[PDB]
Symmetry: D3
Subunit: 151 residues, 6 copies
């Protein structure tokens, strides 16, 4: 019995500005389940593969370089509609348009330094999860409060 | 109309997930006055009364059962437009639609486990207060900051 | 020993200064179980009974007036060593001696305005619970996290 | 860009100074200037000069002089417009949960905070409330992580 | 009456690490009254005046240079035993020895980067206040919760 | 220096991962490595090899395997000792308010977190739980504000 999953990465700026715990707490307190997590400096080639659909966009080389300029926190979270809801929690990709109460709305200013990534769709999420994690890094466990989050 | 009151109940899930203090802090920090509060397991019959308006709805049986499945924190809060503002603070009844920054937006996922109830109108508020509280349980006192919250 | 209980009251100053939610959160996050809670203005008659052991202290008259000067939040909390641990959480009865991280240490200054009471022993806790609550106001339920708080 | 933010007497009285500053700090804006004062009625009449002919102008000045305020200047990209977004709408009733006014107050006449409405007004307010030498220049250690 | 006052300065590291609001909130929530506050880069000669009792200690020269390396937030706070209690809230001057729950215990590591200063005596406080502030920068007002903080 | 910190299964289950990480970040320590896993019984037997002949050892391994843990490496000046001071005493009963155990748990057998007890223990734990390539070298933007 597996719910939907999404890929969330805290970008180098989110690590550098000391926001790792704050971000994780927002997912925990919502009732989502942490399925996987690792901390690494992703290679430029790995980042190009992650962002392959953006490869022709003028910002893509600077995006790859910045994403490689420090470590990221890569995560998989599980729950009902976690992909869409995760994006709502993160706020709009451009922080200018992110509302107060969202992660980007509370904590950052510019699109090129927008602290976090979340998958845009279930299919994107599955691709991203497979790119970043080995299957055995996805931990199956039951949340003690599951029956108080879900009917 | 600084004397308006609303009924707020923390549902069994909210209790079970450790959110009582967080929820009360949100109402205190906003400037609303706590008028009444108690902690109880509401009987089936009491809840049937409370939800008589929904009694011919498909989710009604399940709702009554969930609401009897642990204790609730029942409260009365006072202030200007507290009914409507209380509801904005809680977020949409359906957590899927509740925005980050709201109680449901921040803390829950599914409508059948939506942590909290607030009255939908002044008329419903007065009925709910009467059902859940004895008049002698309503405490009259003056907030020391009242003249800094209200002109 | 996991069934011990203690009586905690947030004093009139704790209510007036908007600390109810903060205080409850501290007990929730520690792992203790909320057994009972109500909000009331305690009568002089009632408070004389509560503070019976301090009846000949020079500060007793003033203490009784203060404690009747606004409502209090009365609570019962359950868990292993909750009486001793509750007092550690609260701090010393003089706030000036209470350490940062404690409730009194963080939030108040003077002994006469020391925001909170906790039972000093198991015997006094049982007396205080009986005085402030009817047995039917003590709610029995099991915390979903119980087996992760206790071995 | 720079904006003027003032925590009004009710914000100070209700113990929200730290909370409010933390919001601006955590967002990535740079604090440029800050002072705490009871603004004189004459200083406030200047601040509110556009309103001198309105019947509520005396009561407004009385209120704004009725306790101290924290006056600040913050710097960042779009900080004028974004500061307003962070404060919430001028009426707390319309301010969303997550905003300063939405989280912390109830009535338009006790709405805890002001921020400049435009770059124009900001430069006016900054010149009025601060001496140039009170605007401190420094670079945030996290600058390269807030801005590309 | 005028209660005791202390001088508190948030050092350039406190400002750079985004701790100004956190620090101010801890003094507000304790119940102390903010009397004066400004934000400035202090001159080396001003800083030598402030630390003149330490002028023969080997750390003194480096301390003056660091304190001039960015702006500070200078404050005056008032309340009962605010000098002594303020120092308890800050923690030991050496963060190595500062307890969790204190400002230095929670937020810093090394004595040369110890985020904050508080006066060590009432006489020191009066000297520091006069050094950093004009008499007219000290604001007299009455806290709305004063009678709930003090008997 | 570096230390090994693990959030135990009860800390994960009770929703304390973010809280705990924030405490280390806000102190000024640098996160060097982090992974989330159900540690295998053999892995845990190695971690607790000194206790293998004690009667409580099977129960301990069983508990530590009963849910996922967050394994971390943190760096900073005397981080081994100071990490232990931040966690509090090994019995939560004796842990003071403000510490992780003092704030968040009750019973010694459900004490939410481990930190290395010594620099030698830290080195052994880091080598057991992480590959060398999983220890990430970067410089904190605030480094010169945390250290002289």
């Amino acid at each position: 019995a597996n719910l939907e999953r999404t890929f969330i990465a805290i970008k180098p700026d989110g690590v550098q500005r000391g926001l790792v715990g704050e971000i994780i707490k927002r997912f925990e307190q919502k009732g989502f389940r942490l399925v996987a997590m690792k901390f690494l400096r992703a290679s430029e080639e790995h980042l190009k593969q992650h962002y392959i659909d953006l490869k022709d966009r003028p910002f893509f080389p600077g995006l790859v370089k910045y994403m490689n300029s420090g470590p990221v926190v890569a995560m998989v979270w599980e729950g009902l509609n976690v992909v869409k809801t995760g994006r709502v929690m993160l706020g709009e990709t451009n922080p200018a348009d992110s509302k107060p109460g969202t992660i980007r709305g509370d904590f950052c200013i510019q699109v090129g330094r927008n602290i976090i990534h979340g998958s845009d769709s279930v299919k994107s999420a599955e691709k991203e999860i497979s790119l970043w994690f080995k299957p055995e890094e996805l931990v199956d466990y039951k949340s003690c409060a599951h029956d108080w989050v879900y009917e």
